[PDB]
RNA sequence: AUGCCCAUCA
RNA sequence: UGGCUCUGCCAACGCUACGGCUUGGCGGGCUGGUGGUCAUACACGGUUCGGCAAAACGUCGAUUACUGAAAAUGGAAAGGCGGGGCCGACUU
C-alpha cells in the first residue's frame, strides 16, 4: 500500500498462493521422497499448513545440509511469491539477478548494449568476498522492514530466516530474494549515492563501465566503503581496465564488438562430483564441494549448485 | 475400539464420498465401478485386518487408503467432463487421513 | 506441520505410482475414446490399466516380492493392450503415435519397477 | 456346509427383497450389496468342502461385510434404504448365522 | 476325465443357459451372477482336469454345489418369477449327473 | 517363449471381431469369453515371468476355456451364433498356441 | 536464468 | 461408455408359476499459449536512435506528518531522485 504492506500474511496463506507455492515447490521435484510423501495426502497437508500459518506457529523443518524439506520449500515459495514481488520491485533494474526477464542475458546484453552506445572506455568490476556467508542478517532484516510492516509476515520472515548471524542460508528461494535485496543497497549506493549510471550487478558480481578509469577507482573505493561499513561485505577480485580485457561478466568476456563466452573448470567439477557419485567416495565430495563452493561464492553458481543438488540430493551448501 | 473406531471414521469416508461416487458419470463408469469397489470394499480390508491380529492384513488396509487416495488423486484428473473437485479430494483426504492417523497407531499397537 | 504419514512407504511405490499416474493420465483419455462397441475390451482395457495402481501400491505396502512381479505382469499386459488397440480393435483406437507416446511412458515405470524389484532382490 | 447355508438362505431371502428395493439411483451399490449377499454363499460352501480354516475366516469376513452393508444401507444410502427395522430383522437374521458360524469356528480349531 | 465333465456339464448349459436368459431383468444382478456361475464352472472343471491339486478338484465341486445354491434360489425368488420348480427339477437332475461324475473323479483321484 | 504371445496375438485379432459380434443378447457369454479371450495374455505372461509349470497349466486351462468358449458359442442360437467355420478355423488358431504351449510345457517337464 | 526435446491447448 | 432394477408399442432364441417374462426391433424418458522433460557469422541482435520524464512505476521523504490515548496489521503528500516509463523514427 505504498510502503506499508501491512496485510501479507492474509494474502501469503490464501489458500489459491499455498496452491501454487505447492505447484511451484513441486516443479521438478516430483521424484523426491519430499513431494512424493507429501503428494499422498498433498490438500490436507496443505490444510494443516495453511492453518500453521494463519496461526504463527510455523517452524522450519531443519535445513538439511543447505536443502529444506519439501514442506519449508513450499512456505519459502508462499513467502516468495508475496514478498518477492514487493522486494524485487525496489530492485533497481540494472539489477540482474534472480529476477524475472532479467537474468543471465538480459545482464549480458544490457552491458554490451551500454557498452556500444555511451562508447565506455573502462570498467569497474567487483566481487563479493564470501556474499551469503557474510549477509548481515541483520542489516538484510533493515531492508526486509522498511518494506513489510506486517507483523506476522516479519515472523514468518524471521522463522524462515533467523535475524541472529551473518549466513544467509544459501540457496533458498528466501535467500535468493534477500541476497538480491541486500545486494540492492550497493545499487542504492551507485545510483543513489554515487550517481553512476552504466552498471550491471548480478547477485555478488558488480560491473560498472566507465570512461575514467579513474572515476572507476573512486566509485570501487566507495563501494567497498561503504559495503564494508553498512552491509559487512568485502571485495575479493576487483580491477579498473578498458574495454580491452572485455568485462568477464556473467561467463562472458564482453566487448563492445564480440561477446566471447568463456571456459569451464564446472566440467572439471561436474565430472569431479559424478564421479565422486560412482566411487562410492561421497564424503571427500563434501570435502570438494565446500572447496568448490569457495571458488564459486565469487562466482555466481546458485542455478549450478541447485543444479548438482538435483542431480542426486547432496547439499552443496 | 480400534476395529469398531477405524470404521466408524471410515464410515465418514464413505458417507462422503459415497455421494461423490454415485455421481461420477456413465461415461466414467469403469473408474466409478472400481472407484466404488475401492471405497466401499475397504471396510472388508479392515474387517480382515482386525480378524487376523497379522501386519500384513493391517498393511493391505493401508494399502487400500492408499489406492483410495490414488482414486481421488486419478478422479481429480479425468479431464473428461470431470467428478471429485479438489475441495472434495481436500474433504476427503482430511476424512482419509484421520482414518491414516488411527491405522497408524493400530499398526503401532500391534508392533 | 510434518506431512500425514502413511504406514509402510516405499520410495519406489510412490515413484512409480507418480510415473504410472502419468500412464494413466495418458492412455485413459484415449482409453475413453474407444467407441461404444469395443467397450468390453476398454473396460477391461480400463481395469488392466487404472488397476496396475493397485498392483504397484499394495506391492509397496505388503513387502512381498510375489506383488511387485504380478505389478510387472499388469504392465506386461498393459504393453499388450497397447498392441491390442493398436491394430485388433478394428475402427482404430490408438493412433501409432500413441502407441510410441504411451510405450515410452511405460517404460519409464517399467525401469522404476525394474529397480525396485532389484533392489528387493538382494 | 449345508446348515450355515440353509439358515443364510433366511438371511438372503430376507435380504434380497431389501436388495431390490434400492432404486435405479443406487443401482451401482446395489449390485455390489447383491455380490455381497449372494456370494457369501460361495463363501460358506467352499470353506465347507475345503475345511482349511482359512476359508472360515474368509465366511466370517463375509458376514461382518454384510453386517456392514447393513449399517451403510441404512443411513449412508440417502434414500436410507434399509428402514432402522429391516436392519434390525436382518441383523438378528445374520446374527443366527453368525452364531452357527461362532461355532463352526470353535469346532475347527478345538486344537 | 475332464472331457467327459464338461461334455456333460455342456447339458446343463445348454439346458440352462436358455433358461437363465430368460431371468427377468429385474432380478438382473442374480442373472449375471448365475450366468457367470453357470458358464463359469467350466473354467473350475478345466482347471481341474489341466492340472491336478486337488483343491481345483474341489473347486469344481464348491462351484457345483453353488449351481445348486442357484437353482434354489431363483425357484421362488420372487414376485417377476424366474425358473419354475420343474426347471429346478429337471437341471437338479442334469446337475446330479455331473456331480456324481465329479464325485467318481474325485473319489479316482483320492 | 514370447512367439506364444504373438501367436495368440492372431488368435486375438481373429475372434475379438467375432466376439464383439456375439449380441447383448449373449452378454454375459460374451464379457466372460472376452475375458477368457483377452485375459489368457495375462496368463501367458505370468507364466513367462516365472516358468512355473502351475503358471504354465494355467495357461493350458485357459486355452481349453477357450476351446469351450468355441464349441458354446456354436450352439448358442439365432443368427448370433459362431459359424461352424470360425470354429474350426480357430481351433486351427488355438491348436497352432496349444502345440507351443505344449512343446513348451516339456521344455520345462524334461529340464 | 538457458536452450533442446516432448505433451496438450488454440 | 455396445447402458437402465425403463417404460409404452409390437414381434419372436425362447421360457412360463399362463399373469407374464425374456429377447428382438420400435418410440419417448433417465442416461502462440500452457505444462512437462533434460543438461568475433567483423554483423547486428530491437543489445537501434532521438525527444520526454507530465503520468504511472521504482525509491527516498516515511512505517514520517496527519488521524486517533496510542498506530493499534490506519495513513499520506509537496518535493527530490531515477528510467524501469513514455512518445515517435527506423527496424523488429
Same mark, same amino acid.
Given at each position: 500500500?505504498?510502503?506499508?504492506?501491512?496485510?501479507?500474511?492474509?494474502?501469503?496463506?490464501?489458500?489459491?498462493?499455498?496452491?501454487?507455492?505447492?505447484?511451484?515447490?513441486?516443479?521438478?521435484?516430483?521424484?523426491?521422497?519430499?513431494?512424493?510423501?507429501?503428494?499422498?495426502?498433498?490438500?490436507?497437508?496443505?490444510?494443516?499448513?495453511?492453518?500453521?500459518?494463519?496461526?504463527?506457529?510455523?517452524?522450519?523443518?531443519?535445513?538439511?545440509?543447505?536443502?529444506?524439506?519439501?514442506?519449508?520449500?513450499?512456505?519459502?515459495?508462499?513467502? =516468495?511469491?508475496?514478498?518477492?514481488?514487493?522486494?524485487?520491485?525496489?530492485?533497481?533494474?540494472?539489477?540482474?539477478?534472480?529476477?524475472?526477464?532479467?537474468?543471465?542475458?538480459?545482464?549480458?546484453?544490457?552491458?554490451?548494449?551500454?557498452?556500444?552506445?555511451?562508447?565506455?572506455?573502462?570498467?569497474?568490476?567487483?566481487?563479493?568476498?564470501?556474499?551469503?556467508?557474510?549477509?548481515?542478517?541483520?542489516?538484510?532484516?533493515?531492508?526486509?522492514?522498511?518494506?513489510?510492516? =506486517?507483523?506476522?509476515?516479519?515472523?514468518?520472515?524471521?522463522?524462515?530466516?533467523?535475524?541472529?548471524?551473518?549466513?544467509?542460508?544459501?540457496?533458498?528461494?528466501?535467500?535468493?530474494?534477500?541476497?538480491?535485496?541486500?545486494?540492492?543497497?550497493?545499487?542504492?549506493?551507485?545510483?543513489?549515492?554515487?550517481?553512476?549510471?552504466?552498471?550491471?550487478?548480478?547477485?555478488?558480481?558488480?560491473?560498472?563501465?566507465?570512461?575514467?578509469?579513474?572515476?572507476?577507482?573512486?566509485?570501487?573505493?566507495?563501494?567497498?566503503?561503504?559495503?564494508?561499513?553498512?552491509?559487512?561485505?568485502?571485495?575479493?577480485?576487483?580491477?579498473?581496465?578498458?574495454?580491452?580485457?572485455?568485462?568477464?561478466?556473467?561467463?562472458?568476456?564482453?566487448?563492445?564488438?564480440?561477446?566471447?563466452?568463456?571456459?569451464?573448470?564446472?566440467?572439471?567439477?561436474?565430472?569431479?562430483?559424478?564421479?565422486?557419485?560412482?566411487?562410492?567416495?561421497?564424503?571427500?565430495?563434501?570435502?570438494?564441494?565446500?572447496?568448490?563452493?569457495?571458488?564459486?561464492?565469487?562466482?555466481?553458481?546458485?542455478?549450478?549448485?541447485?543444479?548438482?543438488?538435483?542431480?542426486?540430493?547432496?547439499? =552443496?551448501? | 475400539?480400534?476395529?469398531?473406531?477405524?470404521?466408524?471414521?471410515?464410515?465418514?469416508?464413505?458417507?462422503?464420498?459415497?455421494?461423490?461416487?454415485?455421481?461420477?458419470?456413465?461415461?466414467?463408469?469403469?473408474?466409478?465401478?472400481?472407484?466404488?469397489?475401492?471405497?466401499?470394499?475397504?471396510?472388508?480390508?479392515?474387517?480382515?485386518?482386525?480378524?487376523?491380529?497379522?501386519?500384513?492384513?493391517?498393511?493391505?488396509?493401508?494399502?487400500?487408503?492408499?489406492?483410495?487416495?490414488?482414486?481421488?488423486?486419478?478422479?481429480?484428473?479425468?479431464?473428461?467432463?470431470?467428478?471429485?473437485?479438489?475441495?472434495?479430494?481436500?474433504?476427503?483426504?482430511?476424512?482419509?487421513?484421520?482414518?491414516?492417523?488411527?491405522?497408524?497407531?493400530?499398526?503401532?499397537?500391534?508392533?
Amino acid at each position: 500500500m505504498g510502503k506499508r504492506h501491512r496485510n501479507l500474511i492474509d494474502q501469503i496463506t490464501t489458500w489459491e498462493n499455498l496452491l501454487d507455492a505447492y505447484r511451484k515447490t513441486s516443479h521438478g521435484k516430483r521424484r523426491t521422497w519430499g513431494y512424493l510423501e507429501f503428494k499422498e495426502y498433498d490438500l490436507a497437508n496443505l490444510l494443516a499448513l495453511q492453518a500453521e500459518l494463519k496461526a504463527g506457529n510455523y517452524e522450519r523443518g531443519p535445513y538439511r545440509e543447505s536443502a529444506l524439506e519439501f514442506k519449508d520449500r513450499l512456505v519459502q515459495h508462499a513467502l =516468495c511469491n508475496i514478498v518477492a514481488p514487493i522486494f524485487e520491485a525496489g530492485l533497481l533494474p540494472y539489477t540482474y539477478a534472480c529476477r524475472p526477464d532479467k537474468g543471465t542475458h538480459a545482464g549480458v546484453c544490457h552491458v554490451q548494449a551500454e557498452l556500444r552506445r555511451t562508447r565506455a572506455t573502462h570498467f569497474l568490476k567487483s566481487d563479493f568476498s564470501k556474499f551469503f556467508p557474510s549477509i548481515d542478517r541483520a542489516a538484510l532484516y533493515a531492508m526486509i522492514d522498511k518494506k513489510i510492516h =506486517c507483523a506476522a509476515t516479519r515472523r514468518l520472515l524471521r522463522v524462515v530466516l533467523p535475524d541472529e548471524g551473518v549466513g544467509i542460508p544459501i540457496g533458498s528461494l528466501t535467500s535468493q530474494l534477500f541476497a538480491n535485496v541486500y545486494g540492492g543497497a550497493v545499487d542504492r549506493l551507485l545510483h543513489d549515492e554515487l550517481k553512476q549510471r552504466h552498471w550491471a550487478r548480478y547477485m555478488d558480481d558488480i560491473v560498472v563501465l566507465g570512461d575514467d578509469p579513474e572515476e572507476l577507482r573512486a566509485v570501487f573505493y566507495r563501494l567497498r566503503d561503504f559495503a564494508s561499513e553498512r552491509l559487512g561485505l568485502k571485495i575479493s577480485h576487483w580491477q579498473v581496465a578498458p574495454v580491452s580485457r572485455g568485462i568477464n561478466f556473467l561467463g562472458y568476456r564482453i566487448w563492445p564488438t564480440h561477446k566471447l563466452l568463456r571456459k569451464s573448470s564446472v566440467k572439471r567439477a561436474k565430472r569431479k562430483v559424478a564421479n565422486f557419485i560412482k566411487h562410492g567416495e561421497d564424503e571427500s565430495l563434501q570435502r570438494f564441494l565446500a572447496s568448490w563452493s569457495g571458488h564459486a561464492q565469487w562466482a555466481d553458481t546458485h542455478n549450478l549448485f541447485t543444479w548438482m543438488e538435483e542431480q542426486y540430493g547432496i547439499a =552443496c551448501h | 475400539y480400534d476395529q469398531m473406531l477405524i470404521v466408524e471414521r471410515y464410515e465418514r469416508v464413505i458417507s462422503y464420498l459415497y455421494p461423490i461416487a454415485q455421481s461420477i458419470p456413465r461415461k466414467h463408469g469403469v473408474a466409478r465401478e472400481m472407484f466404488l469397489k475401492c471405497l466401499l470394499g475397504q471396510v472388508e480390508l479392515f474387517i480382515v485386518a482386525g480378524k487376523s491380529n497379522q501386519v500384513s492384513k493391517l498393511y493391505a488396509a493401508d494399502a487400500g487408503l492408499a489406492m483410495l487416495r490414488f482414486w481421488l488423486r486419478f478422479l481429480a484428473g479425468i479431464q473428461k467432463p470431470h467428478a471429485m473437485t479438489p475441495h472434495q479430494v481436500e474433504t476427503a483426504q482430511v476424512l482419509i487421513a484421520e482414518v491414516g492417523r488411527i491405522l497408524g497407531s493400530w499398526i503401532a499397537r500391534v508392533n
